[PDB]
């Protein structure tokens, strides 16, 4: 992670 | 007797702190049970005969309290009370503890491996032979360490950890620290003693018991970067490994701080549920997010890997070495890593072109923030588990955006120095939100900035500001106002920000800062200027509006040169132009006149903004009665994009951004009968059909050639006979969208009827509904078969919502709004339908406002  | 649980707070008492845990885990991957003994060295700040710690779904076998050693060693039993609702437990001692004197709690417990992918949880995978094999892993964020072993499970109780894992010879253990020694405990057992960690938080403790292969490299710092995965796919970890090494070196240099651990392990867990987690020394990832296959698993996979690895390693310093005092500051964490993804990859892997992705993320963040239903980045969490679901990744993307605006206002090296000083003053400790700002302010530019107060205005307030610039001679007047996009009602908030404005003018090429702390302010320039442009580089988290004739001078700047400002600058101009057209501050004329510049634009970011704002207008016109204006607008769009479409190559070369743009432009040019593209696509399609698919087709052009191949029944029947056999996503969904772009309504109804019985149909209903010839077909089929449909797809997920909203999202006329309301009344269903009816009403409003203007505009030219 989600990065997003 | 009944004992009252001696504690009624959500946080643990502050006056009993641990120093060092000694964890012995013994898990059984075939029984799916694991028992454990944990030793916690503790110190009491105050006198007390009770210890409150966390434990969840663990039957405490027995707990004891020891003090001293040698001839003085004493051991007492401890009474155990359990408050499950709070996930807590109390240990009651007969005589109170002595202030500052060291004690050692020993807890013997057992539990079951969690199926819920939280805590100490079981995972499974099938080898290339069908042999199903199990492994055990951990996911402690935010507060699931309570499930693997009792402890003070709050991120401000940092301790050291001495972990020991009992496993079979078949398996292989890994944890945060390196393995020091393995000792054969019993017949089939082996104890892996892992090195003692540094003072850290509980939720970053990790361990894995698996049968994984690995591949390793060493950086200049001697750090051993290894990538673990299942034996079959381990030849797919070279890329992630090289990326981890490069980025580890980058972070060591950027932070001016050596990586604080001896090694670093990236594990590719099967069916990972969180995407990735930054366990100190043992970062875990979904398989797809870490491993890379020769046959491109995706055109964007090899970029997701880099951004994932950059984020997870950024956390090794920012977040694990320095960790939040309490989850109410987690936002900052996820902000920084997310922003670091940009800073680091932009340097380490320049070929990926991460800038486009990042700034698009900022655009989305603002789009959400501009609505009434938005929250400030910084919110007081009273319970981590309850309000960890409320927080959304868009909040974290804001966080990164704000941090970028800040890095650009302050010197880039000033920001870097502030980070270095922050991480050095606070290593192995916990920090509040304001500590980073305080570290940012004490930096000297090589007027004090007062970062703290400014940043509070962006973190504690929902939404962002609209900035209006008026220019009277050398006097530049600046206005700020909460940019609220909701056109329902007239609610107004007195929100003010410290806007770190940045501008450039036609005279000086240098960037000028100005910190607007009030509603109104005036800036005096040395001499009049041809033009002025604020928010240089699109970095600040605001939008500018130029009063009087500013937009004119900027539109002329773009149409005349356009390289006068940066690619991002042009993208900003387009975005802001149309967003202001929305809130009624800019004429739709002005916006289209602006967009006219797009014939010269080569970069991806402004072209995509222009597409994002122009396509929907044409899409709205498709459902419209008369096409005499729709055709003229499609002609305007293709005249705009004619040079750029021609420039492109029919390959898969370039970055993810460029490949995506290539696909979009070619499919667009071909769906609107652009002679060159249609003929080239028909050529590729003929050659493809001759070999029956044996010939390789560039995956970026396959959509165009298939959309043209479904035109005549000749290619259409072929594509249908081909999709029947295929199961692959890229292989099948592309052909699916191809067959949905047909001018033959017979094939359309055929596809509808056949797909209803499970030939897929969820997406097919929408992809057919948004077809210019047969859009009423898909909306009329959903009314007569609605009962059976809802039965088949129950409720939830995105099928129901993607096919109910997809069939009614682009409705232009009010005659159709009546037909929506009269339908849904005769029947999160209500939420989906309410969103749909609201968006349809907005559609009719936008039509009423702008259609008659756009018609006249399409004539002058
Ligand atoms: C989890 O629980 C399972 C049981 O539910 C447990 O699996 C069993 O472990 C034992 C011990 O390793 C296994 O028995 C061994 O099998 C191997 C392979 O066939 C043999 O080589 C072993 O014989 C050696 O040892 C004998 C006694 O020392 C000697 O007499 C002999 O000469 C050999 O040197 C031994 O029989 C057993 O097969 C498995 N499976 C089952 C169904 O019992 C597992 O160990 C547990 N794991 C953990 C981590 O607790
Ligand atoms: C793991 O789950 C099992 C049930 O699936 C638990 O087994 C129960 O244990 C209690 C007390 O020991 C018995 O009274 C029940 O009869 C057991 N049920 C079954 C189906 O065996 C087990 O206790 C759980 N693990 C732990 C550590 O509590
Ligand atoms: Zn993160």
Numbering used by the authors:
A (entry chain D): 2 to 5
B (entry chain A): 43 to 488, 513 to 825, 831 to 898, 903 to 936
Sentences from the study reporting this entry:
The endoplasmic-reticulum aminopeptidase ERAP1 processes antigenic peptides for loading on MHC-I proteins and recognition by CD8 T cells as they survey the body for infection and malignancy. ERAP1 is a member of the M1 aminopeptidase family, which is found in all domains of life and plays numerous functional roles. These proteins contain a thermolysin-like domain10 (domain II), which holds the active site. The M1 aminopeptidase family has a conserved HEAT-motif-repeat domain (domain IV) forming a bowl-shaped C-terminal structure.
